[PDB]
């Protein structure tokens, strides 16, 4: 589906609604029908919903790179003048909500609508027709939203205690619906290690063999130890699918969704990814993931590492200032001294950040971000290239958390501009190539 | 197989439809020409062999007919 | 004052245990406002009876095991947690289940004292291995909501007394979500969808009216203040 | 020839095509796009577009 | 000879035009090729 | 669409007709030929 | 103001478009203090267009000069010498910020320096000649207006500058809560603000004009631009900031311009921000807003259109502006006056008539079916076709004013044009879903949803946050200034008091002068490279704590516990809240 | 473990415009869901009175100025949006304001018709000079929520009438909080209701309840 501004939809379908409201007594002749739509008499809207029903439309966003750049959807009248786009198709369209626009086309002939619903329908195209990998697979929020749900926390609230002596195990629940009643109260934590009895879910292949081996369990109860979230996670997958019981990285979700397309019909993956979306968002907001000057940490070893390599350069600079050193090797020595010195801060930085820090969880789960990106935010930004392409031996010691200096900022722009200019002519050339490949 | 319930355009599922035709392309002309047939009736002449929905569009009808194996075709 | 569109409460039956209910149309954003309040009233607000503590013969200082049966201590505790019995007492009552027969024990084997009625006799409790006996006492006290197993410092006085997690309310699962309706007349009005899976003690419709009444009366505390402002039906 | 023309070096292509007195059978899909024909691919192929559809005699009975 | 359709997961359909799909599949990532 | 009839079969794009004309103005003789039917006229 | 001051390499007499090599686009070392490296276009024009720097100055020969303070024997004098790029490489440039010694001298053991390479080196301060006049010499006016510039990557900064010039004047025009130095100085030099050129007192103040009685006995008066449609449609309206008896001084601000408040540039509003991801509604740069921003017209802005139609001399007759239209209902003319022009103050809808006009026709040869009806209903076929000015598709508003130029009346017109009428339509545009908002750091996004103030993340006060920004796009884009000013934005809003117990805490050692206390709502300024530092932030994070009652609403991490307005329960983790300056 | 002491709602006072309300006892995990259910209803459906349109003699529309007045008509309507009025009468009732000579006009200068009151006459509207004269009438209606200005082309209004955004919201700011327990542990919530002075925190909370009670049904 897609959100279609009601004004836009009225004009697109204007000839259709004109006939429908003349068929009904609303308008006596086509002339009246035309004016009735132009001035937007309130009667048309109930008519528009009928014509639009199960009548697809094509949505394009330029530039169109692969055929996935055009996809059919079922229109839904929406309030406002903007267009509502499903969050899973942003990957194919390369669509940012920074203010991009999209085009709508109305297939008319029976054949055109057939091709829309069948060939180009949104849910039928999931994997990219290049690598076969899944595209509509969740990303960004939905990643960190699920990664939080499935993750297992040691010493959480209500954790199964493996009780001894005077008390029974204490970590068991009659059913999942009980773990929810325990979660609503402060008893249970969604990330807890407790073990539950599950009637409606399927155990893993291995354990299913030892447990039953006479068949599988639609109603047959079995017990495993998993986080309450991992339970709810597997309720999103098909009832026939085995219990994964893992914390979901992006690649792990790729493995799973990739597998569903082999063992299950398209319509099944279409609905399973819809369910991952709703779940991922809900937990993305409950994830408690924000940013702050506090949540940005810098390693205390940065001072010693920095001042240490400084003398190593000053000594090599003293060796070059002594006349013996080769000028080309001097900078090369500095470039090597500082290059791997950045790795140390990167190593020290990772050691410092608690695994639950919101900045790293974003990169860990594979939702978005890189480590090289979080290395310039805190710690050091590193060396920057000169205009000629050579590496400026003067490193940037400060990080964008502490802020750069007057000269540090002027130097970074030297490189930062060359990169942004490249992206300019990288699209113009890449498109000229594609035009020759196509021909 | 339980896919739950498809809504509107997604019903019937393509998987159940593709077993009734050689490819996704053949399926297109299949339902396409039949829908063009239905609309002529409301003005070839035959169908709606199934029970028409309330306002249901003829193309949507022809899709349900192919799902029920109510018609057959022969490729050129 | 206020006169609005008349909402309609409907019920779709998924099974004898479950039913789906929908309210249409609401006024925006009222769907979200009363929705979470209903999931709480149905879950924690309905009076019901449930098992509190249990003691079984043969387990005192033992950690987990029961020679003579294939069900462990843990598996039987959560096996009894599903027992559904409506007790009219307003005070704890101790039922008893004693069987030495090498066969399957069920909820029907327990003798309820006068005033307590077991609604799920078919429930399996334990499988007795050949030539073995099973003796169990059960504490049943009326309550509301979900009360986790409580060791009160008086649970350490009893030797072999196992406090268990008590499900007091008949509804073991509930959830809700909102949707938009009203093609033209109303624009983007709210529709409330609520899912109720109820125990055999009470049907879904009765749990609703019980939650409806307990909820309506609760807001009377404010309305009694004045009654000046109003709405319509 | 009109597929090579629209691609690149139009003037060059046309001068050599008129001297060679070339004939374009309009088989390729770009040619059919220019003149508004059905591209010879997908639903445009002969076997697919010539499909004939009629309801089964058993179905016409049920009416 | 062609093999499974990456989009379908099954043997390619007879109508498919693999030339264009190939060209696009090669070019589309070109924006990510550093140079 | 206004009569609820079936959408008809497409015609010849006017732009293409203009192409043949612009090619004729270059002293290029462009003839649209039938299978066995020799020359065709656009009018 | 940035259009002027812009310098380009294009046009006749220079390399044009593709011809230019990419080496020119690269920033040279001599662009320091002359052409701003950070401000340029994002598109194919990168590096060919740039804005003159703040202190830069043009030479009578056409070479840009930059101001410097010459240093002699480790002492920086008050002598300021403007130097061309040629003579700069000859000397060595000390760094703008270096420790200052008493009456002045170089305190640091070594001094930052710039060579002809350029090359960065040191000496003992003995060999330095000239020093920088101050930080942000290289920066332009727009660039210098980005708070916490030093923290943001040049990529997102360039986007930040370009998007300030894309803002639009609002109706209220509130100034930034956390600013920089340029806000006031740039508004007056723009020319859109009313400045008084002689010391005196105010004789009268009206929406129409403001008159001042100078000490000189002379009398100056200023007519206020009111709702003047700008080139691109933005509203130019001005408002008087002074009262009747007020004293004033030469060069003061009598009235505010479109985007200015009390003399300094206001390109947007200050809003309560929440950095939690929220129910998938703000995702992939999308944004959500409090419906308060609608009801209270905080983001509302006015836009004005100019429609034009002329009546000329046709070879078949003369065009006549008239209320008579060949075929129309008497209703479609309901809002027209005698002459056929829309009546001032009327509402217009897409397709509505503005100026009725008619042109002669030539032999009609009506269709037989058209002539039969003419006889039946007796409507005589008119001799003139209807060419009439109507409002464009998807456009509506109120009629502001009309301008009519007639030939009968002398006026002036090109040969053939008898009458020309221009109609000005204006409309109040509420902030709507789909509109594009952004901050000064390059962060941009459409409004994805607008929620009732009822269900919004809201502080323990009961104070709903106005905007909710997603957390994911923040870390990777390398603009962390938005978070900083989000914290400081909360500082300046609720006030603060640094502890007077004992002495001054260690974080204030080198730090603010009599900034130890500020009231609630006080405005802050952090010059780009001289601005506040991380240590001083934290120290301020803990700070004065009313709302009304004495409870703190934000911790020293810049976080607070928000209550979901839908379910009504707290959000599991502390969420960062604050005030950020966002532009429409 | 049935524990029954029927919920008790006791009043309080903090300021004149706002007063806290407390309800105890309640089952665990309640006051949150119950508090936000009132807050959501308080901030929206509390009925009230507000000015719909306005008519000024000299001006035919919103974007002009008035002779001698310091505030343009658009910036005057911005001020007038802050008027808090309460109409005890159904149907539209027009107020009147006329001022001459210098001074500063304020909401108090408006003459309320029968059964209508201006609850913040201290409010500044426009500052008039010797030449300035302001003659304007105001139409007060009754409703709830926020209704965007109704265009006179949609209503039967004439080119002179200036429609304005109307906010009927007696309530101002609202919050709550709960005291849990850990004898069995119950929950008790306390709510803070603040109003614009057109009504007291009591009548508002009674409005929500009276409006919230009628909604729940079975």
Swiss-Prot record, chain B:
Keyword Transcription applies: yes
GO BP of this protein: DNA-templated transcription
Name of the protein: DNA-directed RNA polymerase subunit omega
Top EC class for this record: transferase
Organism: Mycolicibacterium smegmatis (strain ATCC 700084 / mc(2)155)
Complexes and interactors: The RNAP catalytic core consists of 2 alpha, 1 beta, 1 beta' and 1 omega subunit. When a sigma factor is associated with the core the holoenzyme is formed, which can initiate transcription.
Entry keyword set: DNA-directed RNA polymerase, Nucleotidyltransferase, Transcription, Transferase
First and last residues shown, out of full length: 24 to 106 of 107
Protein's gene: rpoZ
Gene Ontology CC entries for this record: DNA-directed RNA polymerase complex
Top-level taxon: Bacteria
GO MF terms, alphabetically ordered: DNA binding; DNA-directed RNA polymerase activity
Chain's role: Promotes RNA polymerase assembly. Latches the N- and C-terminal regions of the beta' subunit thereby facilitating its interaction with the beta and alpha subunits.
From Swiss-Prot, chain E:
Positions with a binding annotation for Zn(2+) 2: 1
Role, per record: DNA-dependent RNA polymerase catalyzes the transcription of DNA into RNA using the four ribonucleoside triphosphates as substrates.
Record's subunit section: The RNAP catalytic core consists of 2 alpha, 1 beta, 1 beta' and 1 omega subunit. When a sigma factor is associated with the core the holoenzyme is formed, which can initiate transcription.
Family: Belongs to the RNA polymerase beta' chain family.
Protein name per the record: DNA-directed RNA polymerase subunit beta'
Organism of origin: Mycolicibacterium smegmatis (strain ATCC 700084 / mc(2)155) (Mycobacterium smegmatis)
Gene: rpoC
Full-sequence range covered: 977 to 1011 of 1317
From Swiss-Prot, chain F:
Coiled-coil intervals: none
Domain of life: Bacteria
Disulfide bonds: none
Membership in a protein family: Belongs to the RNA polymerase beta chain family.
Subunit structure: The RNAP catalytic core consists of 2 alpha, 1 beta, 1 beta' and 1 omega subunit. When a sigma factor is associated with the core the holoenzyme is formed, which can initiate transcription. Interacts with RbpA, which partially restores Rif-inhibited transcription.
Function noted in UniProt: DNA-dependent RNA polymerase catalyzes the transcription of DNA into RNA using the four ribonucleoside triphosphates as substrates. This subunit often mutates to generate rifampicin (Rif) resistance. Interaction with RbpA partially restores Rif-inhibited transcription; once the subunit is Rif-resistant however RbpA no longer stimulates transcription.
UniProt miscellaneous comment: Mutations in the RRDR sequence (residues 423-449) confer rifampicin (Rif) resistance. Rif blocks transcription initiation but not elongation.
Protein name: DNA-directed RNA polymerase subunit beta
Natural source organism: Mycolicibacterium smegmatis (strain ATCC 700084 / mc(2)155)
Curated annotation (Swiss-Prot), chain H:
EC number: 2.7.7.6
Keyword Transcription regulation: no
Any one GO biological process: DNA-templated transcription
Keywords: DNA-directed RNA polymerase, Nucleotidyltransferase, Transcription, Transferase
Reactions it catalyzes: RNA(n) + a ribonucleoside 5'-triphosphate = RNA(n+1) + diphosphate
GO molecular function annotation: DNA binding; DNA-directed RNA polymerase activity; protein dimerization activity
The keyword Transferase is assigned to this record: yes
Region of interest called Alpha N-terminal domain (alpha-NTD), as start-end residue ranges on this chain: 1-218
Leading EC class: transferase
GO CC entries: cytoplasm; DNA-directed RNA polymerase complex
Entry's free-text remark on domains: The N-terminal domain is essential for RNAP assembly and basal transcription, whereas the C-terminal domain is involved in interaction with transcriptional regulators and with upstream promoter elements.
Function noted in UniProt: DNA-dependent RNA polymerase catalyzes the transcription of DNA into RNA using the four ribonucleoside triphosphates as substrates.
Protein family: Belongs to the RNA polymerase alpha chain family.
Subunit field text: Homodimer. The RNAP catalytic core consists of 2 alpha, 1 beta, 1 beta' and 1 omega subunit. When a sigma factor is associated with the core the holoenzyme is formed, which can initiate transcription.
Record-given protein name: DNA-directed RNA polymerase subunit alpha
Biological source species: Mycolicibacterium smegmatis (strain ATCC 700084 / mc(2)155)
Gene it is expressed from: rpoA
Shown segment, full-protein numbering: 1 to 221 of 350
């Amino acid at each position: 589906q897609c959100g279609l501004p009601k004004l836009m939809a009225l004009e697109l379908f204007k000839p259709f609604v004109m006939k429908r409201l003349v068929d009904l007594n609303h308008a006596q002749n086509i002339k009246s029908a035309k004016r009735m739509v132009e001035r937007q008499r309130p009667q048309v809207w109930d008519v528009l919903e009928e014509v639009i029903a199960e009548h697809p439309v094509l949505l394009n966003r330029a530039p169109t790179l692969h055929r996935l750049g055009i996809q059919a959807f079922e229109p839904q009248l929406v309030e406002g003048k903007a267009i509502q786009l499903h969050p899973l198709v942003c990957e194919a369209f390369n669509a940012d909500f920074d203010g991009d626009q999209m085009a709508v086309h109305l297939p008319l002939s029976a054949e055109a609508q057939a091709e829309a619903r069948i060939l180009m329908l949104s849910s039928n195209n999931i994997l990219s027709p290049a690598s076969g990998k899944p595209l509509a697979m969740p990303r960004l929020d939905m990643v960190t939203g699920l990664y939080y749900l499935t993750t297992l926390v040691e010493g959480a609230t209500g954790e199964y205690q493996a009780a001894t002596k005077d008390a029974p195990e204490q970590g068991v629940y009659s059913s999942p619906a009980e773990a929810i009643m325990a979660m609503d109260r402060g008893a249970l934590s969604v990330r807890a290690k407790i073990k539950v009895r599950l009637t409606e879910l399927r155990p893993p292949t291995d354990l299913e063999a030892q447990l039953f081996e006479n068949g599988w369990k639609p109603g047959d109860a079995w017990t495993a130890e998993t986080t309450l979230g991992r339970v709810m996670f597997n309720e999103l997958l098909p009832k026939s699918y085995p219990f994964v019981n893992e914390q979901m990285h992006k690649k792990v979700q790729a493995r799973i969704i990739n597998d569903l397309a082999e063992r299950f019909p398209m319509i099944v993956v279409a609905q399973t990814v819809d369910k991952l979306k709703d779940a991922g968002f809900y937990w993305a907001t409950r994830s408690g993931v924000t940013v702050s000057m506090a949540d940005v940490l810098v390693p205390p070893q940065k001072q010693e590492i920095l001042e240490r390599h400084e003398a190593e350069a000053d000594a090599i600079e003293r060796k070059y200032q002594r006349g013996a050193l080769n000028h080309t090797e001097r900078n090369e020595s500095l470039v090597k001294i500082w290059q791997d010195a950045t790795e140390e801060v990167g190593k020290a930085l990772e050691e410092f950040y608690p695994a639950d820090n919101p900045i790293i969880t974003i990169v860990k789960s594979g939702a978005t971000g890189n480590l090289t990106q979080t290395r310039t935010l805190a710690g050091m930004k590193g060396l920057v290239t000169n205009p000629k392409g050579e590496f400026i031996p003067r490193p940037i010691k400060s990080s964008f958390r502490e802020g750069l200096t007057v000269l540090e900022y002027f130097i970074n722009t030297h490189g930062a501009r060359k990169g942004l200019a490249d992206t300019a002519l990288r699209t113009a050339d890449s498109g000229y190539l594609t035009r020759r490949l196509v021909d | 197989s339980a896919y739950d319930t498809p809504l509107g355009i997604t019903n019937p599922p393509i998987d159940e439809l593709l077993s009734r035709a050689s490819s996704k392309y053949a399926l297109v002309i299949y339902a396409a020409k039949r829908a063009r047939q239905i609309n002529d009736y409301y003005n070839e002449y035959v169908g709606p062999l199934v029970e028409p929905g309330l306002q249901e569009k003829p193309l949507s009808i022809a899709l349900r007919e192919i799902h029920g194996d109510l018609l057959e075709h022969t490729e050129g | 004052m206020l006169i609005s569109q008349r909402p309609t409460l409907s019920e779709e039956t998924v099974a004898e245990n479950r039913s789906r209910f929908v309210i249409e149309p609401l006024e925006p954003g009222f769907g979200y406002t009363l929705g979470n309040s209903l999931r709480r009233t149905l879950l924690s607000s309905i009076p019901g009876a449930a098992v509190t503590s249990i003691r079984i013969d043969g387990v005192l200082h033992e950690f987990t095991t029961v020679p003579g049966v294939k069900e462990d201590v843990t598996d039987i505790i959560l096996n009894l947690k599903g027992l559904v019995v409506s007790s009219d007492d307003d005070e704890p009552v101790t039922m008893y289940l004693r069987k030495q027969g090498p066969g399957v024990v069920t909820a029907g084997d327990i003798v309820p004292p006068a005033g307590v009625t077991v609604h799920n006799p078919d429930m399996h409790i334990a499988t007795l291995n050949d030539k073995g006996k099973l003796e169990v006492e059960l504490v049943v006290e009326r309550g509301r909501g979900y009360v986790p197993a409580v060791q009160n410092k008086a649970s350490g006085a009893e030797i072999g007394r196992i406090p268990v997690d008590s499900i007091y309310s008949p509804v073991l699962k509930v959830t809700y979500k909102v949707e938009a309706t009203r093609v033209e007349q109303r624009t983007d009005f709210d529709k409330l969808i609520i899912d109720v899976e109820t125990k055999n003690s009470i049907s879904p419709r009765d749990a609703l009216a019980s939650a409806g009444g307990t909820l309506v009366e609760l807001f009377g505390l404010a309305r009694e203040l004045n009654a000046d402002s109003e709405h319509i039906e | 020839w009109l597929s090579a023309a629209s691609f690149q070096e139009t003037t060059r292509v046309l001068t050599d095509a008129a001297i060679n007195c070339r004939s374009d059978k309009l088989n390729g899909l770009k040619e059919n796009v220019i003149i508004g024909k059905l591209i010879p691919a997908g639903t445009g192929i002969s076997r697919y577009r010539n499909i004939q559809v009629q309801p089964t005699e058993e179905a016409r009975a049920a009416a | 000879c062609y093999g499974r359709s990456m989009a379908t997961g099954k043997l390619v359909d007879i109508g498919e035009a693999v030339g264009i799909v190939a060209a696009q599949s090669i070019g589309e990532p070109g924006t990510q090729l550093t140079m | 669409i206004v009569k609820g009839e079936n959408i008809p079969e497409p015609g010849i794009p006017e732009s293409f007709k203009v192409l043949l004309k612009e090619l004729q103005s270059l002293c290029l003789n462009v003839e649209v030929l039938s299978s066995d039917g020799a020359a065709i006229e656009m009018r | 103001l940035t259009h002027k001051r812009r310098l380009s390499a294009l046009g006749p007499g220079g390399l044009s478009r593709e011809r230019a090599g990419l080496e020119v686009r690269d920033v040279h070392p001599s662009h320091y203090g002359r052409m701003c490296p950070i401000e340029t276009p994002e598109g194919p024009n990168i590096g060919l267009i740039g804005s003159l720097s703040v202190y830069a100055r043009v030479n009578p020969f056409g070479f840009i000069e930059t101001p410097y303070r010459k240093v002699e024997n480790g002492v920086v004098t008050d002598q300021i010498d403007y130097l061309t790029a040629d003579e700069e490489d000859r000397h060595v440039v000390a760094q703008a910020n270096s420790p200052t010694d008493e009456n002045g001298r170089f305190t640091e053991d070594r001094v930052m320096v710039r060579k002809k390479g350029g090359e960065v080196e040191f000496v003992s301060a003995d060999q330095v000649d000239y020093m920088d006049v101050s930080p942000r010499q290289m920066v332009s006016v727009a660039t210098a207006m980005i708070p916490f510039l030093e923290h943001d990557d040049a990529n997102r900064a360039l986007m930040g500058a370009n998007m300030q010039r894309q803002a639009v004047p609002l109706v209220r025009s509130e100034a930034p809560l956390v600013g920089t130095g340029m806000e006031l100085r740039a508004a007056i030099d723009a020319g859109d603000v009313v400045v008084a050129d002689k010391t005196g007192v105010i004789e009268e103040v009206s929406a129409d004009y403001i008159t001042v009685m100078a000490d000189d006995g002379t009398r100056q008066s200023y007519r206020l631009r009111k709702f003047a449609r700008s080139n691109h449609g933005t509203c130019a309206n001005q408002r008087p900031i002074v009262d009747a008896g007020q004293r004033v001084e030469a060069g003061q601000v009598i009235a505010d311009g479109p985007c200015t408040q009390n003399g300094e540039m206001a390109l947007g509003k200050n809003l309560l921000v929440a950095i939690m991801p929220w129910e998938g509604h703000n995702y992939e740069d999308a944004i959500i807003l409090s419906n308060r921003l609608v009801e209270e017209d905080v983001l509302t802005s006015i836009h004005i259109e100019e429609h034009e139609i002329d009546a000329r001399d046709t070879k078949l007759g003369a065009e006549e502006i008239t209320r008579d239209i060949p075929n129309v209902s008497d209703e479609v003319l309901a809002d027209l006056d005698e002459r056929g022009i829309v009546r001032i103050g009327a509402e217009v809808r897409d397709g509505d008539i503005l100026v009725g006009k008619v042109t002669p026709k030539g032999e009609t040869e009506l269709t037989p079916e058209e002539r039969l009806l003419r006889a039946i209903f007796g409507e005589k076929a008119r001799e003139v076709r209807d060419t009439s000015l109507k409002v464009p598709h998807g456009e509506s508003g109120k009629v502001i004013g009309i301008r009519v130029f007639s030939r009968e009346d002398d006026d002036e017109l090109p040969a053939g044009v008898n009458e020309l009428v221009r109609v000005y339509v204006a409309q109040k545009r509420k902030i709507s879903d789909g509109d594009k908002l952004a901050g000064r750091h390059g962060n941009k996004g459409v409004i994805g949803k607008i929620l009732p103030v009822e269900d919004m993340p809201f502080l323990p006060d009961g104070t709903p946050v106005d905007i909710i920004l997603n957390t994911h796009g923040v870390p990777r884009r390398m603009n962390i200034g938005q978070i900083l000013e989000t914290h400081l934005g909360w500082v300046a809003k609720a006030g603060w008091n640094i502890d007077v117990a004992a002495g001054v805490p260690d974080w204030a050692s080198k730090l603010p002068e009599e900034l130890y206390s500020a009231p609630a709502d006080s405005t802050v300024a952090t010059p780009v490279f001289d601005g506040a530092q991380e240590g001083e932030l934290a120290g301020l994070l803990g700070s004065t704590l009313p709302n009304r009652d004495g409870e703190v609403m934000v911790d020293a991490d810049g976080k607070s516990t928000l209550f979901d307005g839908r379910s009504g329960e707290p959000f599991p983790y502390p969420v960062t809240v604050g005030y950020m300056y966002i532009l429409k």
